[PDB]
Amino acid sequence: VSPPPPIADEPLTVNTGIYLIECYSLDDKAETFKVNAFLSLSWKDRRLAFDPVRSGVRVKTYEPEAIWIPEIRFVNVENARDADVVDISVSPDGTVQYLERFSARVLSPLDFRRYPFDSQTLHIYLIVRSVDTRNIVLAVDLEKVGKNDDVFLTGWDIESFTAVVKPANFALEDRLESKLDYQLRISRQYFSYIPNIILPMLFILFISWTAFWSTSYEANVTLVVSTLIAHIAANILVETNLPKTPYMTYTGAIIFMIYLFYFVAVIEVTVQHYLKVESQPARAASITRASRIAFPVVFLLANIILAFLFF
Amino acid sequence: VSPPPPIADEPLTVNTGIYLIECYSLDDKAETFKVNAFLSLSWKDRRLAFDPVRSGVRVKTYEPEAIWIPEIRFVNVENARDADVVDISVSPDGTVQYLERFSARVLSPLDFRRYPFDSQTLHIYLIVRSVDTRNIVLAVDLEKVGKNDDVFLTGWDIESFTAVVKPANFALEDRLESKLDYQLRISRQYFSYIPNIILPMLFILFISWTAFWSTSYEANVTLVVSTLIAHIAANILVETNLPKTPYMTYTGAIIFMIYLFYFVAVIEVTVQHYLKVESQPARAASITRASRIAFPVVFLLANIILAFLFF
Amino acid sequence: VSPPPPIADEPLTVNTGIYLIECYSLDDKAETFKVNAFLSLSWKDRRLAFDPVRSGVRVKTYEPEAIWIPEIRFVNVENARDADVVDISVSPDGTVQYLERFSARVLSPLDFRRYPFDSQTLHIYLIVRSVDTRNIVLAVDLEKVGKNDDVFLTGWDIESFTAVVKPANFALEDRLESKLDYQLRISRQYFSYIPNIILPMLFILFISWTAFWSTSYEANVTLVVSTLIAHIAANILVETNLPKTPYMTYTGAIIFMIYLFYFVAVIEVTVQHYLKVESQPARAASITRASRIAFPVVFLLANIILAFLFF
Amino acid sequence: VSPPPPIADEPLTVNTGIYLIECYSLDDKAETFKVNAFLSLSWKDRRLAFDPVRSGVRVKTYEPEAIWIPEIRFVNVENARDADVVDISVSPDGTVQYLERFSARVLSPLDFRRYPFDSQTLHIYLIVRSVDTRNIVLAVDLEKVGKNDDVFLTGWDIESFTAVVKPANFALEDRLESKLDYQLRISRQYFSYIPNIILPMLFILFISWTAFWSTSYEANVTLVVSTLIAHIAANILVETNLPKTPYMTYTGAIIFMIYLFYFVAVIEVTVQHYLKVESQPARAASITRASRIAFPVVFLLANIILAFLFF
Amino acid sequence: VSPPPPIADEPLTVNTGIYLIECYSLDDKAETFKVNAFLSLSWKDRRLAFDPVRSGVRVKTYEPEAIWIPEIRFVNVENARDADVVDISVSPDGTVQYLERFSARVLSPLDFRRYPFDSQTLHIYLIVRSVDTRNIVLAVDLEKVGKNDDVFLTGWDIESFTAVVKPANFALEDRLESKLDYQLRISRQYFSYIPNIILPMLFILFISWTAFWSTSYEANVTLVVSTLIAHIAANILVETNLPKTPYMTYTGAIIFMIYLFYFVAVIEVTVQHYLKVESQPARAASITRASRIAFPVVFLLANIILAFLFF
Numbered sequence A, B, C, D, E: 001v002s003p004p005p006p007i008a009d010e011p012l013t014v015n016t017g018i019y020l021i022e023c024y025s026l027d028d029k030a031e032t033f034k035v036n037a038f039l040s041l042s043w044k045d046r047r048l049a050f051d052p053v054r055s056g057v058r059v060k061t062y063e064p065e066a067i068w069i070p071e072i073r074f075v076n077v078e079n080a081r082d083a084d085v086v087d088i089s090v091s092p093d094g095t096v097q098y099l100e101r102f103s104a105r106v107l108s109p110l111d112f113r114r115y116p117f118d119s120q121t122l123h124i125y126l127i128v129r130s131v132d133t134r135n136i137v138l139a140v141d142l143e144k145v146g147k148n149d150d151v152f153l154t155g156w157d158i159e160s161f162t163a164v165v166k167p168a169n170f171a172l173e174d175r176l177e178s179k180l181d182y183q184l185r186i187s188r189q190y191f192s193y194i195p196n197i198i199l200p201m202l203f204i205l206f207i208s209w210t211a212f213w214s215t216s217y218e219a220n221v222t223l224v225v226s227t228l229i230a231h232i233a234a235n236i237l238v239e240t241n242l243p244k245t246p247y248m249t250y251t252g253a254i255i256f257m258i259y260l261f262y263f264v265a266v267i268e269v270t271v272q273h274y275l276k277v278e279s280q281p282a283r284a285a286s287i288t289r290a291s292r293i294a295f296p297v298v299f300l301l302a303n304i305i306l307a308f309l310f311f
């Protein structure tokens, strides 16, 4: 089989569409997501023209091996898509209507800067390479782009699924390539992070600040060191759900900052004990009373500054 | 091969049945389950009819490639089902009886609101897309819907496996689609959660309340902070077995509430120590004695309120 | 190809055998095991009979596609077995000898009631469905049932591999089905559980009982709360190696009971401190001295009761 | 195609060779390793003999389907090997030279008795089953047994890759079977275990012995119980990298023994406190001073005994 | 099909190129990475030569089965590459242009000596085995070596993708083999290691040094033992992200050294308490005051020495 011949000199236009059936396994660490969808393709092949009078039928049904089919691939997939042809319908003028159902693991980078209050634009890049006989170009049939109402991505809200209608046509290894960008816009469901990580992390921090109403050094050491260890556990828990980034994330910034608060609280508890032992408790009392106001105030202002820098 | 032609203008009715052989791997985080079952299909193909008295044969056995077979798919599967055709039988009037054994990973959302005392309705959606020649509609043969007695889903009780007999007929990408909903009703075996998570979590909380019968600040700090850390470990353990939800689960609510009890217990232990240091122990004694009643009473009433809101 | 015709009205007997080559990956949580074995099949096909003299051959070899082969399946497998035909030999009377080597992941429920001192009976269920032409029944050729001497299942002792010679014949989707039960009897190697979990768990418990020879409340709180946390770690470790069961396991029972001992030890440590503060140490001394005997005695008797109920 | 006929009554000798290209994923828990290698086969087929003078060709190249090829399998593999035929060459006398590149997951038991100072002999068992026409026997062509210089198994040193030249010929399911044993000798790189597990474990143990230079019961309880918990963490870490064995490993023995040292240290700390409270500190001083020598001395001698029993 | 015949006695030159489309899953423990790329091949086959005037075409498009294609393999892959042929084009003089898109998991050793400030050279080794008929040699077409601008390897910076133009020609099982080395140079994004592991590890160490401003033995024991346990947690966390190496890594060296600092801090805290109890506090004061300077100074100098030895 060979490509359809041009009537004049034009490129062959392959109309495309993606209809999402299932979205699952958005893996933050791997920066992948799995998709189950319909891929629709349409092109004119006049060599397949027929008379409904002679053949009896108004539409011809073909097997993929029987006719020429454009070699359409995905750019950002781990392995080639698992595809099953649903239908190949040829109309009397030779217009082919191809429909396949596929499943694929898509690699799409994620911006974790505002995590867990982040939004993402996932991409599915469709591509075709031109052949010697003819140049092939891709187009979007907007009537065949969409998603099932039941499409749910656990832990995310699906906003939209649209296609950039203009393909990116470029030269690659001395041949033309036609690339389409299908965009799935999603926003993270931050809800569960509040009772599971944010509030527990704030509770243990506020518990360490009870040391500013205690003169007992041994109890103070226990309060600040124990809550610090619990903070380390939350830091480790959070970093297991995330990849290593060459930038600070919002959560990462807060988690890092809270270490500084634990470090300065240990200094305060040490300074307080040292002065008490040196028979200077009046002074220790001034530092401890100031700390009761300074620690929550600096914590609030530092969080306002961080929220401002990130949002 | 082409679809069987209509005698009048009627859609082709494909009778379906699913008989469960195995149920395994209900993954709560992934919201998937694996299934091994029989899929039965039945439709009339008049082009295949034969005489019973002339032929001598009551039934004719065909290979899948020899005859037309409807393209039946599952909506909510990760990848296409792994299927092996078992038998194809044709009756004299041309009634085809198709049987395949398949295995599939099914995506079906779970409602964790009442976890671990939750019940679920798992779905297996059967679908067929109509052809240009004619419309294909699905039906349920209740005689061919069921499950093996030995079907066990580890950690769950299987209640029923039924089908919604009326299909959901709708247009998708300019062709009719006929969808059937097979429902597997299950209820979680909550038993093991009681000795492994619920009672250990209650024991450590009650151990923190022994601080209300102690005047030793240093021992009190050790009691409340150590048990809090053990509570954090249980919180982390529980959240590893569950996906992130945009709602509170019953267990999540109790786990979150128990933090408030630890936080107020730390305030009480701090207030008690502060007053004793300020030579006001009579008062500290009033707060500590009130706490002995208030903490278990507010804990009981808050749990009655939560159980009422969730069940 | 069609099934061999009956001389009278008899069912077709397919003689079976399973010879285990490899046993691996017994997954307790998943209740699965992987198997690599020979599957042997034997039946009479009159249509393939020959005379040895005029043929010059005592045996005839065929390709699977050339002749009729019974559709033998496994009931309790995740996916269909990976099989490769080794040999197909036909004797003069048309007796077919089929041999395949296969690998499969088998689902077989496990009884964890006596864990880690438990024994199991793993099952491999062989099945065949009848055809309209004739009833197909399974039999066991005991001469072709066995296992390689080197077959080892890591963490288990293999006792026997036998077959229940009488098949379970029953109707399924209006056709008769013939099922054979191959049983692999195994017993768990409990050895490693003694130095890794049982003795460490006993050591930390006995360490908490040193609080009955101490009047220091602060030290006592540290002894009982620290060892309790280590007990929680062992509880979590044990429950990660096991599925959730709607019953108590032997280890689960002991682990749960040990919490009660920690809870009562905290009450004792609290009561002791309370009385000392109330200037009643003579009394506290009576409770502490009684506890030194009561705790190990009640622990021994409770363990004798538990061992009796479970074994 | 059928096997080459015997000139007299001799068995068909299939000469074999395995050339390792890659070794990876030695999984201690699973007792598996992955291999990527060349498999070379050689046998005489007189039916393929030709004249080199008149043919003008020294060698003929065939496709696997064109000629008879012996069914060679691996005994100890999870699934059948993934193989790609590289070349088939026939010499004028009819000697066939077969070469394939394969990849396989091999099951090979490991002896953990001396872990992490252990050495292993990994096995790759080659097998052939005799056909009805004639008996097939395996041989080793030492000229075609080897490994690439770059073959590296992460965490191990590769010593040798040799074959036991005499096959194990035996009857299995009324046929002959010819088995070859390919041995890959490896020794574990114990280096990293010293700074990561052994020395940290010794440091925390020696830290618990500082309690023999302290009269503070509260500090002593904290020293011995905290380091014990850290020892439990190392015990858990070590047992996650290993399967459960029906014998003691060297590391397992040391880890278990160190619990006894923690248990006796708690007794000593308890006895010391008890005597001080009973106004017998002179005596407590004698036990504590003896403990300073006894604990390191008994620890050294017990380790010499253990090293002797294991090496 | 057979290889192109030599005009004189020359080896057949196969020109190669690799164009990277995707780079993902660099697994440090496994020492693997996944790649999705174009593989281009070019060679002269005179038997395929044609006259452009006579044929009426300037290029000829074949199917892989229709013509001879060199058996090109990757040396350092887990399994054979997943490949799909994109195009085969023949010029009038018989110059074949082959293009395939492939995906593979590549084995490539990593040097962890400078981790997490390390750089790596990943290798993709292309290989061809000669045939009896002629010798096959590989070459690099630099015009067909490259990478897509969007190629990103999570946690790494991609520096260059080049090929060593001179192949490594050698004998393997009496046949010539021609090997090409494609090199992907990468450098680790160490950024996230600073707020997540390095600074938290320094903070807990500096917190242990507050014991040099405290005379409270019980508080000191709590400070040094608690922070040591947190250091053990970081040691375990770090070693889970890395394979076991027969050498010290930079991070491993620092982590190991920090144990020595904890060990000597415990000795100091013990010596200080012992002297106080022995009524020698003036002396204890001299050791504690010296420790305040000695510990940070020796820590800084030891780190300068380590950084010098490693970089």
Ligand SMILES: [Cl-]
Binding pocket: A072, A073, A074, A075, A077, A079, A080, A081
């Ligand atoms: Cl693709």
Ligand SMILES: [Cl-]
Binding pocket: B072, B073, B074, B077, B079, B080, B081
């Ligand atoms: Cl499907």
Ligand SMILES: [Cl-]
Binding pocket: C072, C073, C074, C077, C079, C080, C081
């Ligand atoms: Cl099967």
Ligand SMILES: [Cl-]
Binding pocket: D072, D073, D074, D077, D079, D080, D081
């Ligand atoms: Cl094999």
Ligand SMILES: [Cl-]
Binding pocket: E072, E073, E074, E077, E079, E080, E081
């Ligand atoms: Cl390859």
Ligand SMILES: [Cl-]
Binding pocket: E169, E170, E171
């Ligand atoms: Cl050489």
Ligand SMILES: [Cl-]
Binding pocket: E130, E135, E174, E175, E176
């Ligand atoms: Cl050569």
Ligand code: NA
Binding pocket: A001, A064, A065, A066, A067, A068, A069
């Ligand atoms: Na085609």
Ligand code: NA
Binding pocket: B001, B064, B065, B066, B067, B068, B069
């Ligand atoms: Na068909």
Ligand code: NA
Binding pocket: A222, B222, C222, D222, E222
């Ligand atoms: Na303490």
Ligand code: NA
Binding pocket: C001, C064, C065, C067, C068, C069
């Ligand atoms: Na057949």
Ligand code: NA
Binding pocket: D001, D064, D065, D066, D067, D068, D069
């Ligand atoms: Na063959």
Ligand code: NA
Binding pocket: E001, E064, E065, E067, E068, E069
């Ligand atoms: Na070819």
